[PDB]
Ligand binder design. Structure first.
Ligand SMILES: [Mg+2]
Ligand SMILES: [Mg+2]
Ligand SMILES: [Mg+2]
Ligand SMILES: [Mg+2]
Ligand SMILES: [Mg+2]
Ligand SMILES: [Mg+2]
Ligand SMILES: [Mg+2]
Lengths: 129, 218, 98, 83, 208, 71, 23, 129, 83
RNA sequence: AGGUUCGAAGACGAUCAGAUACCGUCGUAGUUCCGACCAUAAACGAUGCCGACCGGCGAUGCGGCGGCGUUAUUCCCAUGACCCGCCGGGCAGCUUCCGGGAAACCAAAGUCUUUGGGUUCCGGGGGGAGUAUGGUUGCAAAGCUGAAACUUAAAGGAAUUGAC
RNA sequence: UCAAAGUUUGAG
C-alpha cells in the first residue's frame, strides 16, 4: 500500500535487461552492482530501485516470455518454432469429406477426384431467439 | 534546408515531378508545405481574411485563443483557404498560411459565351456551401468583374477568376464559414463534368510508378 | 431536444394504452412505459432456509417461491436505483443487465 | 449492384418476383384439366377456383376453394400442360 | 485470371482447398458477396464458387506483380491466424508486413516513425484488419482482402472469397497468393510444384 | 407545398395578398391606424408650441437626464 | 406559468362578461 | 397520384445517374418520354435505351453512361415565346455553353437550339445537362 | 477545353472513374489507379504491359469497387468468365 | 338510474417562520349506466394527404406460394404446431460517407441555387395577445373567427466548454 | 426501501 515504481524505473529496467540479460541475475545484490557498471545512474536510490525491478523481471523471464521485451535467445527459439513444417496436413490423407452441394460444384467445375460424399442433416434451426 | 518527410516530397525535391498538375491529376495528398512553395514559389500570395478570437470557459476564467483565417493564391488557377486556431496570433497565422498552402486547389476557369481569348470567368454556374452558408458562383461576361461580397471577392480574385456574378445566402456574416463555402465552390469547378471533358481518359503511369527505381534511392 | 427516439415508452402503432398505478408511489403511468421488475424469490431467503429445513415436518420438501410483477414509475425506479441514468452512447443499448 | 441486366433477368429470379413487377406483368396462376376417379369426363379447373367445382356427370365435388389455390378432393389428379 | 489454359486450376489444388475448407464460408452472407457463391446448404453455410475464388486470387496476383518495387506491397494481419501467414508471405514475396496492432496513422502521418506509404494493401479480414482499410483512403491505396460471406467490401478494391475464419484455409490462401505472384515473374516454374509447404503458413494453436 | 399549376394565378395571388398582412411593415402602410396615430399627420416635421421644459430621465444603463420640451 | 396565466385570463374575462351584462 | 409521367421518369433516370447505376427502368413510358430520351440520346447524354412492350402502358430501360449531371423537368408546361426562351435558358441551364431546354412545339419535342433554328416557339417540358 | 482559336486551354485534364465516367478530382483521395499485370499467354509470367483501371472515391466507399474491377477485367479478357 | 372504490371542493392531524400545499384521517361534486349537450388535450411521430424514385441486414404481424425433416392419429390419408425460404402489404428495429440538415438527427427530415409530380392547410423578431371589439355557436362553462394603441433588441433553437 | 433547508449591492 505504497510503492509502485515510476516509468523511469520501469523503462531503465526494461532496457537494461534487453541489453544485459546475460550479466544480470536473480541474486539481487550482484545485479544491483551490475546496474551500476553497465548503466550510468545519477543517484543511489534510483540505482537501487532499478535493480529491484530488474530482479522482479528476471523472475518473470525465468517462467515464459514478457510482452514488452526481447531476449536474443527467446527470439531465436521463437523463430525456430515458427518455421516448423511436418509432412503436411492439407492433403487430408486419402478421403476428403464433402457435401452433395460441393460435389455438384465440382461437377460444374469438372472434377471427380478421391473425395467422399455425405449428408443427412435436415434444415435444423440455427441459433435460438 | 528542407528534408522531405514524404515519398512525394522526395520526388519533388529531386526535380522529378515537373508541375503540381502532375500531382493534382493523381489526386495525391500533399503533406509537405514546401512542395507547393517550390512549384508556386512567389506568385502565390497570402492574405489574412480575419482574426477571430474563440474562447473556452475554464474553472479559472477562460482560455481565450485565436483563429486566423488565411486565403492564398497566385492570381492564376490556384487558391487555398487556411484556418489555424492557436494562442498568440502570429503563431495562429503562420500555421494557417501553411494549412492554406497544403489546401491549394486548381480552378477550372472558363468563358462566358463567345469562346475567344483566354479564360476569364467560372465555367459553369457552381456552388459551394457550408454550415448554412451557400455561395453560388455564376459565369459572367468580360468586364463585369466580381459582382460579389468582399470575402468571396477576395478568394475569387486570388483564384484567378477574373469575372463572376455571385449570390449567397445563410449567415454569410460567419466569415470563416462564408470563405469556406466560396472556397468549396471554386474547388468544385474542376469537379463538374461538362461535355468539354467527356473524351475517355488515357491514364499515365503516376509519379510513384514512373519513378519507382528512383524512390528506392540508389 | 428529443432525448429518445423511443420516447421512453414502448408504444408504436396505438395512440393509447391502459395506465398502471405504480407499485411504490401510486403514481399513474402508462403500462408500456414504466420500469417493470418481475421477481421470483424463495419465500424464506438464504439464512433462514436451513433453520426451517432443520425444523420441517416434511422429509426433504422443495420450498415454494414468490412471484411479483412490480411496476415502477420513472421517478420511483430512478430513486430506489432500479435504473440509473446513462451516457448518450449507453442510453441506446437496450440489453438487460447480466 | 451497380450493374444489372434489367433486360435479361433469369427465370430463377422472375419466378420469385411479384406478378406485377416482373418486367412483363405475367400471371401466377393456371388451368388444370382435372380427372376425378369415378367419371371418365375431364373437367377443367382454374388453380384459383373460388367455386365448388361440380363435375359434368355431377357425381362428386372437385375443388373446395380457399385463400390461394383450390383444395382438390382426395383422389383427383390433374395436369397443367398448355400455353 | 485468364483461366484459359495455363494458369487454370489442376486437380491437386482443388483437393487442397477442399481439405482446408476455404469453400466452406459463413452463415451471414453480405449482399456484396452474393456474387461468389454456389449455394447455401441445409444447416446454414454458403459454399463459395471456387473457380470464382481463384479468378480473383490470380487478379490479386496480377495486381501485386504490377507493383514494381515489391516492398511497398504492404500486407497485414490483425488476427492470430494470418499473423504468421502474412509474415511468411512478405518474406517469400518481397512485400512488407504488419503483424497485429496496426498503429492508427501508419499510412497517414508524416511525422510519426512507422510512416509507411505503400502502393497496395493486402489485409486478411476487412472486418478486423479494418483501421488500415479506412486509412487506405486518406492516402490513395488500392487493396486486396480475404473476405468471407460475412465481410463488407467497403474500400476493398479486389476481394477474395475465402474462409478467412479457418486458420488452415487462411495460410492456404496466403500460400496460394505467394505461389501465384512468384509464378508470375521469377522463382517458380509451374511445371514443377513449389518447394514450400502450405503448412509453413498456418497458425499454430499452442500444441506441443 | 405550392399551388404550382397553371390556372392557379388567382389562388396564388390572393394567397400572397392575404399573407402581406402578416408583414409588420406592410400593415403599417395599409391599415389606417399608424397614419392616424402620429401627431405629425404623416409629415416630416411639424410646428408646435413649447408648453414646458421637461426633465427626461434616461434609460437604465446610461444614467443621465435628457432635457426635453413638451410641445 | 402559462396554464395558470390562461386561467387568470379566463376568470378575468368572466368578470368583464359580468360587468358588461349589467348594461 | 401518377400525374406527370415524364416527371417521374426523368427523376428516376437522374437518381440512377447519381448513384452510379449502369442502366435504369422507368415504369409508365410514353410518346413524350420516349421523345425526350431520343433528344438526350442525340446529344450523347444517355446511351441507347430500349422499351418493353407490355400489352399495356410501357417500360423503358435506358443504358445510362455516367455523363448526365441532371435531367430535370418543368411543370407546368409554360408557354415559351422565343423572346423569353433566352431568359429561360439563362436561369435554368448552367451556362451559355452546355445544357438543353427541351420544349414541345408544333414541329416536335426538341431542344431550344433546334427550335431557335426553325424559329418556332413552344411549351417547355424539361431540361438536361 | 479549347477556345475559338482551337488551342487547348485549362491547366489539367482530370482522371475519370472507369466505373462511372465521373471525375476523380484534385483531392479525391479515396481514389485508386490499380495497375494490373498481363501474361504472355503460353507461360503465365508477367510480360511488361498493364491493364490500368481507375476508380473514384465514391464508388469505393459505396463498396462497389471490387464489383467494378471484376467487370472491367472481363471486358479486357483478364478474367475468364466465372460461369 | 346508481353510488364500491377513489376523490376537486370542504373539514380536521401534521409539517413549517407561516402551509390557506406537498404527508396523513374523513369527505361533497365527480368517478359508474342510459338519454341529451359540450368540441377541447403535449388530440404528439410536436413531422398534411396521394404518387414515384434512392443501400444493406436481421426481426416480427396477416394473407399467399414453395420446400426435407420432426411432432404426430390409428395403419396411411387430410393435418394444425414446428423448421427453412420467396411474394405482397403492416408495426417497428439495427445498419452505413445514399443524400440531407443550425444541428440533435432523419432511408426520410433524401431525390433543393443542378431549385417546378399533384394539391390542402398554414409562419413571417419578441411582447401586447388569442387580449379588446364586432359577429357566430353554446343552457353554461366556453368554442370558432380576431385587431389595434402602446411597447421592446433581442426573444429563440441546436450544439460546446465550464460552473453548479 | 425519501423529516426541515427561504433569500442574496442600486452602489459598475
Ligand atoms: Mg393521444
Ligand atoms: Mg389529502
Ligand atoms: Mg365526467
Ligand atoms: Mg389546438
Ligand atoms: Mg422539409
Ligand atoms: Mg423550394
Ligand atoms: Mg410576431
Amino acid at each position: 500500500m505504497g510503492r509502485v515504481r515510476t516509468k523511469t524505473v520501469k523503462k531503465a529496467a526494461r532496457v537494461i535487461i534487453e541489453k544485459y540479460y546475460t550479466r544480470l541475475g536473480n541474486d539481487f545484490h550482484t545485479n544491483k552492482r551490475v546496474c551500476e557498471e553497465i548503466a550510468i545512474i545519477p543517484s543511489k536510490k534510483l540505482r537501487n530501485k532499478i535493480a529491484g525491478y530488474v530482479t522482479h523481471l528476471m523472475k518473470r523471464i525465468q517462467r515464459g516470455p514478457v510482452r514488452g521485451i526481447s531476449i536474443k535467445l527467446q527470439e531465436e527459439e521463437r523463430e525456430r518454432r515458427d518455421n516448423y513444417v511436418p509432412e503436411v496436413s492439407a492433403l487430408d490423407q486419402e478421403i476428403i469429406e464433402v457435401d452433395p452441394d460441393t460435389k455438384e460444384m465440382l461437377k460444374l467445375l469438372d472434377f471427380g477426384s478421391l473425395s467422399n460424399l455425405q449428408v443427412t442433416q435436415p434444415t435444423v434451426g440455427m441459433n435460438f431467439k | 534546408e528542407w528534408l522531405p518527410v514524404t515519398k512525394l516530397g522526395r520526388l519533388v525535391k529531386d526535380v522529378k515531378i515537373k508541375s503540381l498538375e502532375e500531382i493534382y491529376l493523381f489526386s495525391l495528398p500533399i503533406k509537405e508545405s514546401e512542395i507547393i512553395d517550390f512549384f508556386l514559389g512567389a506568385a502565390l500570395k497570402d492574405e489574412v481574411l480575419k482574426i477571430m478570437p474563440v474562447q473556452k470557459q475554464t474553472r479559472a476564467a477562460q482560455r481565450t485563443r485565436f483563429k486566423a483565417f488565411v486565403a492564398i493564391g497566385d492570381y492564376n488557377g490556384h487558391v487555398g483557404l487556411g484556418v489555424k486556431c492557436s494562442k498568440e496570433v502570429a503563431t495562429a497565422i503562420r500555421g494557417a498560411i501553411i494549412l492554406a498552402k497544403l489546401s491549394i486547389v486548381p480552378v477550372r476557369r472558363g468563358y462566358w459565351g463567345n469562346k475567344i481569348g483566354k479564360p476569364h470567368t467560372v465555367p459553369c454556374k457552381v456552388t459551394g456551401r457550408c454550415g448554412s452558408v451557400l455561395v453560388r458562383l455564376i459565369p459572367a461576361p468580360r468586364g463585369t468583374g466580381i459582382v460579389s461580397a468582399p470575402v468571396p471577392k477576395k478568394l475569387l480574385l486570388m483564384a484567378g477568376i477574373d469575372d463572376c456574378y455571385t449570390s449567397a445566402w445563410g449567415c454569410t456574416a460567419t466569415l470563416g464559414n462564408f470563405a469556406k463555402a466560396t472556397f468549396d465552390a471554386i474547388s468544385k469547378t474542376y469537379s463538374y463534368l461538362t461535355p468539354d471533358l467527356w473524351k475517355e481518359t488515357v491514364f499515365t503511369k503516376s509519379p510513384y510508378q514512373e519513378f519507382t527505381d528512383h524512390l528506392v534511392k540508389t | 431536444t428529443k432525448k429518445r427516439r423511443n420516447n421512453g415508452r414502448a408504444k408504436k402503432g396505438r395512440g393509447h394504452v391502459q395506465p398502471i398505478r405504480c407499485t411504490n408511489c401510486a403514481r399513474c403511468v402508462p403500462k408500456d412505459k414504466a420500469i417493470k421488475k418481475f421477481v421470483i424469490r424463495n419465500i424464506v431467503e438464504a439464512a433462514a432456509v436451513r433453520d426451517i429445513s432443520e425444523a420441517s415436518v416434511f422429509d426433504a420438501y422443495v420450498l415454494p417461491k414468490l412471484y411479483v410483477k412490480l411496476h415502477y414509475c420513472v421517478s420511483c425506479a430512478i430513486h430506489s436505483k432500479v435504473v440509473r441514468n446513462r451516457s448518450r452512447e449507453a442510453r441506446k443499448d437496450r440489453t438487460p443487465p447480466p | 449492384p451497380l450493374a444489372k441486366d434489367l433486360l435479361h433477368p433469369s427465370p430463377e429470379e422472375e419466378k420469385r418476383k411479384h406478378k406485377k413487377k416482373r418486367l412483363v406483368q405475367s400471371p401466377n396462376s393456371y388451368f388444370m384439366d382435372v380427372k376425378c376417379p369415378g367419371c371418365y369426363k375431364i373437367t377443367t379447373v382454374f388453380s384459383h377456383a373460388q367455386t365448388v367445382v361440380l363435375c359434368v356427370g355431377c357425381s362428386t365435388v372437385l375443388c373446395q376453394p380457399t385463400g390461394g389455390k383450390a383444395r382438390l378432393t382426395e383422389g383427383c389428379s390433374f395436369r397443367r400442360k398448355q400455353h | 485470371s485468364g483461366a484459359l489454359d495455363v494458369l487454370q486450376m489442376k486437380e491437386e489444388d482443388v483437393l487442397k482447398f477442399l481439405a482446408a475448407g476455404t469453400h466452406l464460408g459463413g452463415t451471414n452472407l453480405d449482399f456484396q458477396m452474393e456474387q461468389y457463391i454456389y449455394k447455401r446448404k441445409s444447416d446454414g453455410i454458403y459454399i463459395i464458387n471456387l473457380k470464382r475464388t481463384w479468378e480473383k486470387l490470380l487478379l490479386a496476383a496480377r495486381a501485386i506483380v504490377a507493383i514494381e518495387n515489391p516492398a511497398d506491397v504492404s500486407v497485414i494481419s490483425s488476427r492470430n491466424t494470418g499473423q504468421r501467414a502474412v509474415l511468411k508471405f512478405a518474406a517469400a514475396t518481397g512485400a512488407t508486413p504488419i503483424a497485429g496492432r496496426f498503429t492508427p496513422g501508419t499510412f497517414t502521418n508524416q511525422i510519426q516513425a512507422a510512416f509507411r506509404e505503400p502502393r497496395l494493401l493486402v489485409v486478411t479480414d476487412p472486418r478486423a484488419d479494418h483501421q488500415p482499410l479506412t486509412e487506405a483512403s486518406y492516402v490513395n491505396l488500392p487493396t486486396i482482402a480475404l473476405c468471407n460471406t460475412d465481410s463488407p467490401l467497403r474500400y476493398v478494391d479486389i476481394a477474395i472469397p475465402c474462409n478467412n475464419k479457418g486458420a488452415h484455409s487462411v495460410g492456404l490462401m496466403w500460400w496460394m497468393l505467394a505461389r501465384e505472384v512468384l509464378r508470375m515473374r521469377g522463382t517458380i516454374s509451374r511445371e514443377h510444384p513449389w518447394e514450400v509447404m502450405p503448412d509453413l503458413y498456418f497458425y499454430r494453436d499452442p500444441e506441443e | 407545398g405550392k399551388c404550382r399549376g397553371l390556372r392557379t394565378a388567382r389562388k396564388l395571388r390572393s394567397h400572397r395578398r392575404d399573407q402581406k398582412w402578416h408583414d409588420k411593415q406592410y400593415k403599417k402602410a395599409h391599415l389606417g391606424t399608424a397614419l392616424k396615430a402620429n401627431p405629425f399627420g404623416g409629415a416630416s416635421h411639424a410646428k408646435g408650441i413649447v408648453l414646458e421644459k421637461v426633465g427626461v430621465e434616461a434609460k437604465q444603463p446610461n444614467s443621465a437626464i435628457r432635457k426635453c420640451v413638451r410641445v | 406559468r402559462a396554464k395558470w396565466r390562461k386561467k387568470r385570463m379566463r376568470r378575468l374575462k368572466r368578470k368583464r362578461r359580468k360587468m358588461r351584462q349589467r348594461s | 397520384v401518377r400525374m406527370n409521367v415524364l416527371a417521374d421518369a426523368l427523376k428516376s433516370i437522374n437518381n440512377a445517374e447519381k448513384r452510379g447505376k449502369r442502366q435504369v427502368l422507368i415504369r409508365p413510358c410514353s410518346k413524350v418520354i420516349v421523345r425526350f430520351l431520343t433528344v438526350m440520346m442525340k446529344h450523347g447524354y444517355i446511351g441507347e435505351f430500349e422499351i418493353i412492350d407490355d400489352h399495356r402502358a410501357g417500360k423503358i430501360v435506358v443504358n445510362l453512361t455516367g455523363r448526365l449531371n441532371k435531367c430535370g423537368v418543368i411543370s407546368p408546361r409554360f408557354d415559351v415565346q422565343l423572346k423569353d426562351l433566352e431568359k429561360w435558358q439563362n436561369n435554368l441551364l448552367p451556362s451559355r455553353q452546355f445544357g438543353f431546354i427541351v420544349l414541345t412545339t408544333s414541329a416536335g419535342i426538341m431542344d431550344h437550339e433546334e427550335a431557335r433554328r426553325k424559329h418556332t416557339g413552344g411549351k417547355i417540358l424539361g431540361f438536361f445537362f | 477545353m479549347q477556345n475559338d482559336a482551337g488551342e487547348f486551354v485549362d491547366l489539367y485534364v482530370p482522371r475519370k472513374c472507369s466505373a462511372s465516367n465521373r471525375i476523380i478530382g484534385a483531392k479525391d483521395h479515396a481514389s485508386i489507379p490499380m495497375n494490373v499485370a498481363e501474361v504472355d499467354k503460353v507461360t503465365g509470367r508477367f510480360n511488361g504491359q498493364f491493364k490500368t483501371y481507375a476508380i473514384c472515391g465514391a464508388i469505393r466507399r459505396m463498396g462497389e469497387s471490387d464489383d467494378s474491377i471484376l467487370r472491367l477485367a472481363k471486358a479486357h479478357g483478364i478474367v475468364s468468365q466465372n460461369f
